[PDB]
Paper text:
Heterologous expression of the Kp two-gene core operon (KpDyP_Enc) in Escherichia coli BL21 (DE3) followed by protein purification via polyethylene glycol precipitation, size exclusion (SEC) and ion exchange chromatography, yielded readily assembled and [name]-loaded encapsulin shells. Based on gel densitometry analysis, on average 12 copies of KpDyP are present per 60mer KpEnc shell, suggestive of encapsulation of two KpDyP hexamers per KpEnc. To investigate the structure and cargo-loading mechanism of the [name]-loaded encapsulin, single particle cryo-EM analysis was carried out on purified KpDyP_Enc. In line with our previous analysis, the protein shell was found to be 24 nm in diameter and to consist of 60 identical subunits showing T1 icosahedral symmetry. The shell contains two open pores at the five- and three-fold axes of symmetry, with a diameter of 9 Å and 3 Å, respectively. Due to its size, the large five-fold pore represents the likely access point for small molecule [name] substrates to enter the interior of the compartment, as suggested previously.
Encapsulation is mediated by specific cargo protein motifs known as targeting peptides (TPs), though the structural basis for encapsulation of the largest encapsulin cargo class, dye-decolorizing peroxidases (DyPs), is currently unknown. In this study, we report the structural and functional analysis of a [name] encapsulin system from a Gram-negative pathogen – [name] (Kp).
Author numbering:
A (entry chain A), B (entry chain A), C (entry chain A): 1 to 267
The structure:
C-alpha cells in the first residue's frame, strides 16, 4: 500500500483497467516534450533534488575555515484532480464499452499541458528555466504563409551549425503552426517535402505551446529527471461520485543553451 | 437443413458455385463500412441482442425493493429478394460462361447500400444511431474544388488530435467526392500526394453515402456485431423462374463519439 | 475487486462468514419458485437479455429491403438494503454466538418475496408475465374446508391430462392453504394421504403468494435465467452502523401455458 490509496477507491478491477488504458492513450497523444528531451527512468518517491555540480561561497564558520554550499534543483510535483460519476464504474462490470471518461481526459490534457509548458517556457516557482527562454541563440519569427517556412528553418539550422551543435535536428510546432504547415499551399509548392528534406524526423505536434522550436537531439542537452511518472491516485468518494487525481514528479534542466533555437509565433 | 432452404431450390451445384462467386465479388466491391469498422465473427442465428451495460430505474416491486432493467440493442435482419430465369441456371451445366446474374448483382448492391447507410447515417427503426449523426465533433463541409481538400483534411485531423484520439486516420468518401479527388487538378497540384501524406491508408470508396467521414481505426470505437453474414436463401420457383434472397443479420454501435469527424457534401 | 465492494466494509472475516451462513439459511427457507421452475447456472454480470426467437416487422430501410427486429426479454436487478449496528460485527470476533441479524433476515424475506411474486404473479415493469396470469387453463377456486381439496386437485390433474402435459405434478400452496391442508380434519379423513397419493412429491410452501398452483415439472416449461445469484454488497458505514444490500439479477419466462393450473384463494 502506497500513497496512491487505490484499494480504498470503490472502483472495480475492470474499471481500473479501462481507466488506465484511456489515461495512457490520452497521455501519449498529448505529451510532446518527452519526444525531444532525454527522459530518465523513474527514480522513486524519495527523489527530491538533482545536484548541479556548482557551489556558493558562504561566510566562514570561524578561524581560517572556508565554506561552500552545493547547489541543486528541487523536484516539483504536479497533481490534477477529477471526478467520476460511479455509474460508469458500475457499468464497466455490467459490460459497458462507452463509459464516460471525459473528466479523466480533461485532467490528462491539463497535466500534459502543464508539464509541456514547464519544460518549454519554464516554471519560475519550481526553479525550471525552460528550453526557450534559456536559449543563447537569436529567436526567429515564423512567417504567416507556409511558403516562408523553409527559409526560417534553414536560417535556424544555420544558427545551430554555426554554434557548432551536431546530431539530428527536430522541430516542435504549436497547434497553429502545425496546422498551417500541414494544410499546404495554394501554389502547389511542396513545402512539406522541402521541410522533411531539411529536418531529421517528423514534426512534433505540441498543443500546449505557441510558435515553435528547433533543437538537436544528439543527447546531453536537455535533462528530464523523473521521480514519479504520471499515476492515478484516490482522494475521496461520495454515494454518487469518486474523486481521483493524476500525479507526476519531475525536474528539468537545460544544460546546453546553444543547441536550441526558439521560433516565435507569426504576427 | 437450415432456414436457407437451399436444397429445395431447383439449382444445380455448378450454378450455385457461380452464383456464390458472383455474389462474393460484388459484395466485396460494394461493401465499405466493414473496411473501417470493427467487424466481429458471426455469432449465429440465435444472436438477438447486445447488452450496452446501462440500466433504467423501474418502479419498485414493493416494500423497499429497488429494480433496474438492463439495456440492450436488438439485432436487425435485412432481406432483399431477386429472381432468376432458370435458363442461366440450366445453361451453367451445359457450359455457359456468360449467364445473366444481373438481378443478383442488383440485390447485392441494394443490400450493401442499406447496410452502409445504416452504419453511417443511422437507421432509426432498428435503433442504430449511425457514425455521422452521433459525432461530437463539428462537421466540416467539403470544397467544390479538389485543391481545397488538403485544408479540410488538415482541419479534421486537428479536430481528432485536439479531441485526443490516436491511431491511424482513414477517410471514407462518397462517389462524387472520390471521383473529384481522383480526377485531379488543372494547375498540376499533387493534391492526392498531399492527401496520402496526411492520411494513414487508402481512401475508401463508398457509393452509398454522400460527403465523407474521417475517423480513427485504433479499435474499440465502432462495433459491428454480426449474427448472420450475407447469405443466399430460397423462397419459391416457377416453371421459368427461381426466387432467391440475400439476407444478413447485424447490429451496430458507436462507442466513442470523438473519434469521428463528418464531412458534408459540397454546396 | 467487483461491484460488491465487500473489502471496503468494516466487517471482519468471522462476521462475514456468520452473515453469509444466516443469509443462505433464510434464503433456502423462504425461496419457493426455485423448487418448481428450471433454474439455470449464473450467467455473469454482463448477462443483459435473453432472446425469445421472434421478430417484429419494421418499416424498410429503402428500395425493396425488408427489415425485422429480433425480440428479447431484459434482465431485471433486485436490490434490498439493510443496516447492521456494528456491535454484533465487533462481538462476533469477541466470541458472540447470538449476534442480531434481524435486519439481514428481513431483507432476505423481502427479496425472496419479491422474486416469488415476480415469478408467480408477474412483474409488469420488468416484462415478466408470471406463471399464473399466463396460464391457458381455467383457474380453480380452493375450498374453505380441507375435505374438498382432493376433489379440486383431481380436477386440476384432469385439466393437465386433457391438455396433454406429462411428467411429475407438483402443487405450490400459500401459507393459509398450506396450514389448512396440514392442520387436518375433525372427521378423521386422511386428506393429506389422499393428496400425496395424487401428487408426485411434497407440497411446496410459498409464503409470498396466495391460493396455489398445480404445475408439471417435466422440464422446459418455465425458464429462470440467472445472471447474478443473491449476493451481499456494501454501500456505506457510520461510526455505529454498516449499510449492506442483498442483490440478485434474473429474468423469467413461461414457455408452455398449458402446463400450469392456477388455484385461487378460498372465498
Amino acid at each position: 500500500m502506497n500513497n496512491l490509496h487505490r484499494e480504498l477507491a470503490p472502483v472495480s478491477d475492470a474499471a481500473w483497467e479501462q481507466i488506465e488504458e484511456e489515461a495512457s492513450r490520452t497521455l501519449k497523444r498529448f505529451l510532446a516534450a518527452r519526444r525531444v528531451v532525454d527522459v530518465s527512468d523513474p527514480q522513486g518517491p524519495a527523489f527530491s533534488a538533482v545536484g548541479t555540480g556548482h557551489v556558493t561561497r558562504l561566510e566562514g564558520p570561524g578561524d581560517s575555515v572556508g565554506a561552500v554550499k552545493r547547489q541543486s534543483q528541487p523536484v516539483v510535483e504536479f497533481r490534477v484532480p477529477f471526478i467520476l460519476t460511479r455509474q460508469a464504474i458500475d457499468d464497466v462490470e455490467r459490460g459497458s464499452q462507452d463509459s464516460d471518461w471525459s473528466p479523466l481526459k480533461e485532467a490528462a490534457r491539463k497535466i500534459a499541458g502543464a508539464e509541456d509548458r514547464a519544460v518549454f517556457d519554464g516554471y519560475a516557482a519550481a526553479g525550471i528555466g525552460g528550453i526557450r527562454p534559456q536559449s543563447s541563440n537569436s529567436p526567429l519569427t515564423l512567417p504567416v504563409a507556409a511558403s516562408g517556412y523553409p527559409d526560417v528553418i534553414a536560417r535556424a539550422l544555420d544558427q545551430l551549425r554555426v554554434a557548432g551543435v551536431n546530431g539530428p535536428y527536430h522541430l516542435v510546432l504549436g497547434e497553429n503552426a502545425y496546422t498551417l504547415i500541414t494544410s499546404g499551399n495554394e501554389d502547389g509548392y511542396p513545402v512539406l517535402q522541402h521541410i522533411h528534406r531539411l529536418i531529421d524526423g517528423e514534426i512534433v505536434w505540441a498543443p500546449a505551446i505557441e510558435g515553435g522550436v528547433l533543437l538537436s537531439t544528439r543527447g546531453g542537452d536537455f535533462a528530464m529527471d523523473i521521480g514519479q511518472d504520471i499515476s492515478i491516485g484516490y482522494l475521496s468518494h461520495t454515494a454518487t461520485h469518486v474523486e481521483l487525481y493524476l500525479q507526476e514528479s519531475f525536474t528539468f534542466r537545460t544544460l546546453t543553451s546553444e543547441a536550441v533555437v526558439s521560433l516565435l509565433p507569426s504576427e
